[PDB]
Design a protein around this ligand. Sequence first.
Ligand code: JBZ
Ligand code: JBZ
Lengths: 213, 209
Amino acid sequence: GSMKIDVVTIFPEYLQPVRQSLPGKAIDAGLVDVAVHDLRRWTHDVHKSVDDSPYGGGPGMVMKPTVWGDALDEICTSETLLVVPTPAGYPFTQETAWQWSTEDHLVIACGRYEGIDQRVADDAATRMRVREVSIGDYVLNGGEAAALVIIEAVLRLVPGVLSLLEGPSYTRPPSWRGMDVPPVLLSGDHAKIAAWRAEQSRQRTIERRPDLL
Amino acid sequence: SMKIDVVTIFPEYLQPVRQSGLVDVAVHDLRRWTHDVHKSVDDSPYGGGPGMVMKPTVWGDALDEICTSETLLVVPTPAGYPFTQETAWQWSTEDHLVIACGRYEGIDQRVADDAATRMRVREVSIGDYVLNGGEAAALVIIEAVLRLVPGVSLLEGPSYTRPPSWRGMDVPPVLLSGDHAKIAAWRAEQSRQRTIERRPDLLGFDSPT
Ligand SMILES: COc1ccc2nc(C(=O)O)sc2c1
Ligand SMILES: COc1ccc2nc(C(=O)O)sc2c1
């Protein structure tokens, strides 16, 4: 398909390598376009302020609603899927990536400090689809690394752009530092090979991810 | 003091680390440890299957030079143990992390097996989705760990700042009241509501759908 992704951030250089990692063939065929925008373009003052103190007290700072509102007004339309990475979000999974892979337009809003004033997402949700998501149970400094992960996971599911656990894999040489490749893999018995791989998958899932069982 | 070494066939993809003397980060091109003209690092899998596997020989030579017996070797993979906030706290007091980034369908299993005979090894997943390689996972792990380095339950609720009315939407009036007890209670109730709706697993309830 043809997908446009806009990313808004106070650290636009963070996103530049993924921009360049796009294959020319996909860009030239108009299959994908990733654009990155400096949030400070929409600030109101000579000091280019994007943050302010939290109502109700507490540590850190909160990103200003007036700046974010102006940025999203310009970039989003009614057809936009607005993605807001946050530790308090719904889980982003492979199922999510498959769903988003058929979208015409994703906009990813990257927070810093303690996050974005909640009225920004609440206002946007009255005229477009909004999704607050987390990429895992750890705390980052901001949304930029989450945006990188989401872009990679989604775009590899777009044609021509980019349960049990998988078991161990092997290639040449057949013997290395005293360790031989499991002989069953060189046996030419492909039903037996499939059964061996299934059992390796079972054992690894029990050991590393008992939640999946 | 922490040293982090990252090994990858795409060193350019790690440039965003430059977010910043208590920690040093270095990035290495895996292909520098090859000896042939085509600099090949991959071949077809034994036993069949799609795609290619990274050869153990080149990885062995790279890690021989970079690692010591005190190194914690980190290998991002979808088949890993989960990387969580607990993991980040644990790794925050390490002297030396080495992060090995896979491409293609992954790395020959004997690389981790051989390394484990001389150092501690951790295969980890940063979440249940598929990347094209280990590089983005390395960036996530580095950011989560470095913010906990000495000298550097429930979901968080919503945050607000000025102005107190915007586009006809009000900041919750309790937050303007100056009543610490009432503010703490409201914030606790917002967090409860959020966790039940979005992450019921954190409170010991079934996950949706
Ligand atoms: C302030 O912006 C943030 C901070 C932490 C954070 N952590 C995420 C995660 O997905 O784990 S997204 C995100 C956004
Ligand atoms: C081939 O190297 C890969 C590929 C996908 C992948 N996915 C990860 C994740 O943690 O979800 S780590 C990782 C490494």
